[PDB]
Design a protein around this ligand. Sequence first.
Ligand SMILES: CC(C)OP(=O)(O)OC[C@H]1O[C@@H](n2cnc3c(N)ncnc32)[C@H](O)[C@@H]1O
Ligand SMILES: CC(C)OP(=O)(O)OC[C@H]1O[C@@H](n2cnc3c(N)ncnc32)[C@H](O)[C@@H]1O
Ligand SMILES: CC(C)OP(=O)(O)OC[C@H]1O[C@@H](n2cnc3c(N)ncnc32)[C@H](O)[C@@H]1O
Lengths: 663, 455, 666
Amino acid sequence: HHVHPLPDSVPESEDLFAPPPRMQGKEGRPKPHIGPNYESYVKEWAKTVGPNSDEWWAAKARETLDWYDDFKTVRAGGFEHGDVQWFPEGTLNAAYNCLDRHYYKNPKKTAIIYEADEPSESREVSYEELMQETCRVANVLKSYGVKKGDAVSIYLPMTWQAAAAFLACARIGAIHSAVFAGFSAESLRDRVNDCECKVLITTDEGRRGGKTIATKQIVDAALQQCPLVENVLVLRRTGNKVPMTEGRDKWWDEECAKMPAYCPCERMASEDPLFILYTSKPKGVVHSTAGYLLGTALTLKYVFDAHPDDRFACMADIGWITGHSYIIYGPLANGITTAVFESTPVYPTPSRYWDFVDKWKATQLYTAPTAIRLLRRMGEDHVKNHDLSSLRVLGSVGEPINPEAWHWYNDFAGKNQCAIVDTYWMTETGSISIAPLPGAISTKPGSATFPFFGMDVDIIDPQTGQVLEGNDVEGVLVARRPWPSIARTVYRDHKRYLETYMKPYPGYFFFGDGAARDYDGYMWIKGRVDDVINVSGHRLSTAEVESALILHKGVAETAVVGCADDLTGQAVYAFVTMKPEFDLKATKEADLSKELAIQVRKVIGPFAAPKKIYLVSDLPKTRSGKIMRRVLRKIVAGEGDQLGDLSSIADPQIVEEVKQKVT
Amino acid sequence: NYESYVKEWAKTVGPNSDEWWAAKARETLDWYDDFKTVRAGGFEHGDVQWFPEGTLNAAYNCLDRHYYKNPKKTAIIYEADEPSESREVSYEELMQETCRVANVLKSYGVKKGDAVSIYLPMTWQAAAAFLACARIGAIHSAVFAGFSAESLRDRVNDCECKVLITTDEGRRGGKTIATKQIVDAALQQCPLVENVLVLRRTGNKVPMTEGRDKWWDEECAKMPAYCPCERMASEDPLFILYTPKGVVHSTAGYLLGTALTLKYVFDAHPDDRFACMADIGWITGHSYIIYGPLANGITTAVFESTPVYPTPSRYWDFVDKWKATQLYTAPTAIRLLHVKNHDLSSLRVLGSVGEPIGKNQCAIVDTYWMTETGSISIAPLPTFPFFGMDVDIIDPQTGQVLEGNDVEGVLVARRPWPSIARTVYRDHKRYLETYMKPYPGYFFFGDGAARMWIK
Amino acid sequence: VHHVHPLPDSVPESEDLFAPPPRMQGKEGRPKPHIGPNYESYVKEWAKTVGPNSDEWWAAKARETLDWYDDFKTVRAGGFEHGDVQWFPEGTLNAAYNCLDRHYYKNPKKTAIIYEADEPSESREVSYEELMQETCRVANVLKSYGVKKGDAVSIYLPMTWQAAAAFLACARIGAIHSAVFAGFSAESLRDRVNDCECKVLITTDEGRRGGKTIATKQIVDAALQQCPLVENVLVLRRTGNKVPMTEGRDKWWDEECAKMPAYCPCERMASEDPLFILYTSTGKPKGVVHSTAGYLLGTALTLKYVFDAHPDDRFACMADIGWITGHSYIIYGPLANGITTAVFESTPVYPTPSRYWDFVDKWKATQLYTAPTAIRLLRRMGEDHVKNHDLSSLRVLGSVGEPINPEAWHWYNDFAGKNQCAIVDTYWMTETGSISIAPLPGAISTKPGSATFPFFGMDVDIIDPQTGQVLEGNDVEGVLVARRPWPSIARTVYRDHKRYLETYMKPYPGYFFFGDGAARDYDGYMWIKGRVDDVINVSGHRLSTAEVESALILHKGVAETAVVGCADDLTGQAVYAFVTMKPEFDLKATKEADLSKELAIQVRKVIGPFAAPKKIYLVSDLPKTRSGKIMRRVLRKIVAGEGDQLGDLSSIADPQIVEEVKQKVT
Ligand SMILES: CC(C)OP(=O)(O)OC[C@H]1O[C@@H](n2cnc3c(N)ncnc32)[C@H](O)[C@@H]1O
Ligand SMILES: CC(C)OP(=O)(O)OC[C@H]1O[C@@H](n2cnc3c(N)ncnc32)[C@H](O)[C@@H]1O
Ligand SMILES: CC(C)OP(=O)(O)OC[C@H]1O[C@@H](n2cnc3c(N)ncnc32)[C@H](O)[C@@H]1O
């Protein structure tokens, strides 16, 4: 075969994982929405793509969401000019679908499990309570002159009221723009200025992992350079003294106390913007309303097999698209219970996730490979002595999951009784693009497997621009047709949207990731196109080399970048982090580096073996867990003085250590 | 009989009452969009909801739909302060004037959800001013024309309106109210008011501030006599009424309440001539001069005078002149009133309201309610709680209901009703503390009662 | 014999009735007419559209013709007296959705606009997809400026195809566009920009017309010096030549639109929400306001029936979008019907007088719609420019703007139509929204110079202006009035409803007053013969301008004429005639004094002794508006010695012509 699976210590013949009994309708669990095999996935998927898929999408849109006005047209527009339309004539409101309609059915049902930074302060928030808070905030925003179509910046940490702030904007047709709490004043300023908002919602302080985030202090520094912001609504999360500017700044509780606990919903067109979400100039990805909401609702239902009484635990942050789609919009649109997790995976101890799961009997868990590798690094004593049997689906999002970490997830979090859904997508796709349906698909460690409903993906040969038909092909991932939750533009920069996604391969949407489809038709997304390394004509994905390195005992996490080489074009350079227990005296660093290189050579080939290996205490990462290989690539290339605004990455101090180790 | 008012009332209260209420809302009002949910929310947090997904317009229900059916029908019997100056105002004329004023307001930049203060005496154009605001989704705040400059200022400032509708002068009991003079005094300390629309009721010289002040007639003459109706959510606010606390009523529930009570408590019929002698500056004039009668498409009276001008026979002269079919007044006026040789036979119902209190023919209906209730809550049907009203007696010393008959305590309501006030403008905390906290789970009217007798 | 006579013609009356020709009979593979084949087929359908039982027809047509977001309940209400006309009031819709989206969803690649550039070689087809995308981009730009539903937006654009996108972007978001003829003076632009109180103006750097540059941005800058409310100007880069741009206020159309997505939601408009203000040229500028559903329905129905438009037709209205004709029969009517419409950027004589016909044969136009002034202009230029063309794709030729003299009607019929097209003489006004009286080409046998019969929904009569009373029967003459509102009637004059009532509704209470003299002949055909204010009363004989001007043009060498009245001690008024001759006419073989005698004799033979002009002035051209109306008021006041009280003539087609006329009279 030309395409190989991501390196794994398990033989390929023993590495296929059928839906386990918890996902077979056994063990008293709900029967899966799609099952029990691959063909059941294909039979339904075939209804969602192609020239006769309007019927399926029209029915799903009308069955899944409540509409004030019906639509007539299912879809129109396309990539070339960026005029994608779905259900254009219909009207709806996201807050109505995420709150009102469920409150009218079961007001006391839990909407949010609020897992506070300190475990003792966690509590359940009913749909009634969440709706009331959302309506109060919406009324406050209207009193500030916020109109349909106005942008509102949100700089809130992971307290449950973040959901109320999102949905209060959606309720009145405002466009919320959420910024990770803890982003520097500079990063906040750039995003507040770009969306041209006049109102900002924030906290006095945030709490995360027992640390205080001085949000109001950061807001005050940023707003000195944000001339349009005239109103700041400040949630009293900690109660510590913070500055408050007379007139501009008001307290959330004092303002909401003046307002009624119900607010009508603004009737939104399907294509009215729902939010702007900046990714790392800052790129404001814009999603509209109906198509995005439908995509998050359908993917949540089908990829995680969500049922009415499920308790869904997405442990990400609402500053990330993962939090937009699979904390707030998806779970609440489905009317189930969703977790707002305010802490870190290791506060107070690395048992936190699992204490949380057993306390609330979470039925699905969704996190990132960085968190899985972090907990794997800390040892099994924190997870082994838990129940965790309420879980039946474990999800991974953010980057390729190394098969080694996949197995740890499968073995310890799931006890070999959960389906693992490796979900590939992007901020720009709105909802999950490629993922196993857990009641249907037998999984391979490291493979997203098959495309979701409405996603028709192909592999293009970047040297020819042509689609590679069939299986056992490798290249760059593209999508053939629009899908309902695709981002509609980049805020006030449609040209950047067209040039980034629609022009590289005309006729297609360009994801920016390298991908392969193996002989069984499974899709493998193996890293960013910009991270590919070419050694003596061999094209290397980051995931395959990083997956080989972690097979060595004691390795916690690695990142590989290319460095120019006069004789091989590029050479692989690897940054490697070891588990805390690994003794760098019994195995001197030079001996360990040799073993790591040998391991890569045996599993991939000599061309992939790192020419140099740097042992570091940690890797530069974004708040969401992405490993910033561009930073490492520029440091190795001697361009460490031209890196840009890294002030809001997870730990800026790590960039200095890496610079020292390389020098 | 008892088995008639109680048989029907059982369908309007309790866990099976949504069916009755959905049918009446759909029979009684014209809707642009249908509702799905009948009711939601409750007293505790003040999130009462009725017909939330529906859309409608109060001006469409009080003017347009009747104008389309019978444009020449009299909407308002305008009984001027001088009896000789009275005249009938047709639904066509009222709708045209309402639309002109609505177009004037839009030309000032009044948007859906904006407050507009109204400082008008009892001339028929007061209805046009109310319904013009409702037509465009503005929130009118009516201020009784007998209020001083300070009381006017306080209410104008509290609601943050940018527009005020008033008159040059008012005429009541043969005397002149210097309304524009009072308005100018008030507006010296009202920094948000940018436009004043001044109805020329007397034509006597009054001060007018260039730019800020314009004449009603001259502004309306520039505008077309039709204006589209803003499609309002059932729970969009309809008006603020300061009682200073701004009692806020929403649209669909309030309008349904007034229309049903008017039809049942007063047994209205399509060609009736309903004469409520109250003032549009108070809820009685809101509900049973303007919104109740015009929603039903009947004829309503706008009485500009006093009970004793020119003489104490004025009420009975008015009833004989117009053949009024109902007469709704307070005991205060009915006691102050010269009634011997009058006919008064056209009257089918004599209503009383506002305080504890025909000659063998016209009925006597004693109606209890409050500004916060929107429409009549307890009354006899020609006593007995109205449809949707489930009231109980509670001992204040225990907070417990005094089940039975011969008990005495405070009056409370069990569940929300459609026309209940939804908040106190920008002071929801006061709304909850006043009405919802004294007896958790109940609505606290604030008066005593015993069995039903209202103390 | 008859009291009412046809407009003077050299063809005998018995040979002057033209039945629908074979191209309009469903033969030769042409589409079958929507109404046909005779007068009775028109009456049978027309009778459903007027009277007390016509709600059914109008409700069905409104629901069949337009896409609605919300249905209506009431068909019509209101009336003339107070100006509260309402049609389909409870319904909601959007004009851009009906003109773009619904057709784009059906056939995105169908041509929406044939853009005939000033230079023929630069012309191209603009698909519904491209037009919708550009409309959506502009709509998004306007929203980014804070334009809200109900805000006015001024448009000062020449006849480039993007003018349609600018109109429809305003309609898409519920803004009220106010389009001003490109080339109007800074003073005229200022007055209209200030009256509508807009805060946004859309224009070009420059326009191109007849090989000439229109300094649109320079004019805008001059005007905006006196327009304190305008905060944003969007400038279309039509030529790319250097023009001033004010930092902050002014932005380039292409740079702004490139930032925006190519789709924009449609604002759900009430039937009676204003769609546009259109200013017309005697006092202050008159902003005629049209609402949405009735206007759109009227333009859609008249286009379909008066021009017998079918799905694949290529409709060529050669007017300007600054004129109501361009509003209704370039943009809204044709695009609502989903067909192809022409945006003609040039003049009838650039590069040569063959332009119209080169255009028709190049694009295979199926209908042509222009004005008598253009027809008379091409007539004066000779037959070599039209004779050697095909023109067989045409089957309907339309004329709008003024009475068409039978002499010009025949030239149109003979050379443009080759006696195989139906001629539709369409009478209406800015204030009527859509065509009011016109032949239905598959049904009505035409008379040269007659509008013939009223359109669906139009119930018209003749009032004797000397009595104020309706004249019953046929063979009557007086002033035209309408008995009942129709869906596309103007709803007000912007912020001046009193002027609307006093101009149209007060002169003849109970009726709508058009302001034109009219006659209904013995066959019931309607003749619109000139403005009431232009009637000339000589010794008790009331003379219409059209009849005398039609008699004069029967003389060899006459190109165009205008007659006005001047007080006369012996006849009350006397006829004075301003005459333009063809360039080739030898004015020395026939001296000016000699020609006048022949003209007077011809008018006497054809009309009567009283109609002979008392004085005749030879002029090189006549004062005319941009749209072709002859400004007889200007001539009338000059003859009356009142040339110093003429008003704002800065924006007429040729202001210099007024100076010559003053000289000739002096
Ligand atoms: C949802 C959230 C992660 O979106 P973004 O923050 O916009 O980042 C999107 C980018 O992340 C990477 N990626 C995310 N998931 C996976 C996965 N399962 N397998 C492989 N690569 C994955 C890709 O490079 C993608 O372009
Ligand atoms: C409708 C209008 C009067 O409302 P408000 O002006 O808010 O005053 C309401 C208050 O008036 C008094 N009341 C009203 N009706 C009656 C009645 N039938 N018998 C005895 N007392 C009555 C009560 O104290 C009530 O709470
Ligand atoms: C549509 C556009 C021309 O409207 P306006 O520019 O408002 O001018 C309207 C005026 O033009 C004249 N008129 C237009 N058409 C004809 C015609 N066929 N026969 C005779 N007179 C006609 C009339 O005097 C009309 O009042």
